[PDB]
Design a protein around this ligand. Structure first.
Ligand code: HEM
Ligand SMILES: [Mg+2]
Ligand SMILES: [Mg+2]
Length: 87
């Protein structure tokens, strides 16, 4: 619990603009505000899903091992349990 700060998806949803962009990937929240400019796939696809769980798009694109490593530096917390899928 403790080493983990939780975020309700309703809060994540509000970080959907260039000033502060967050995104959920496999139950974890990422502050990608500084990452936007450096994303090889470009900014637009990230703006389209900012504030939301983009796990499915992330996985369908087929990101590389180094892409997944890059996620870590932007990890800020976990999705609140109330917002998680039931199974
Ligand atoms: C809205 C979610 C995301 C979408 C739709 C997306 C989409 C894409 C697309 C379309 C490409 C180019 C495909 C190709 O290599 O031919 C790409 C490449 C890449 N993306 Fe994303 N991306 C997303 C999130 C992220 C995140 C969170 C990171 C990590 C911080 C990331 C890191 C990369 C990197 C490093 C590449 C270069 C190719 C690779 O290493 O796999 N992307 N992305
Ligand atoms: Mg704040
Ligand atoms: Mg590695």
């Amino acid at each position: 619990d403790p080493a983990v700060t939780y975020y309700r998806l309703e809060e994540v949803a509000k970080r959907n603009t260039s000033e502060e962009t967050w995104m959920v990937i496999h139950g974890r929240v990422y502050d990608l505000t500084r990452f936007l400019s450096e994303h090889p796939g470009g900014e637009e696809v990230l703006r389209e899903q900012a504030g939301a769980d983009a796990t499915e798009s992330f996985e369908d694109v087929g990101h590389s091992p180094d892409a997944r490593e890059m996620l870590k530096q932007y990890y800020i917390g976990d999705v609140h349990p109330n917002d998680l899928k039931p199974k």
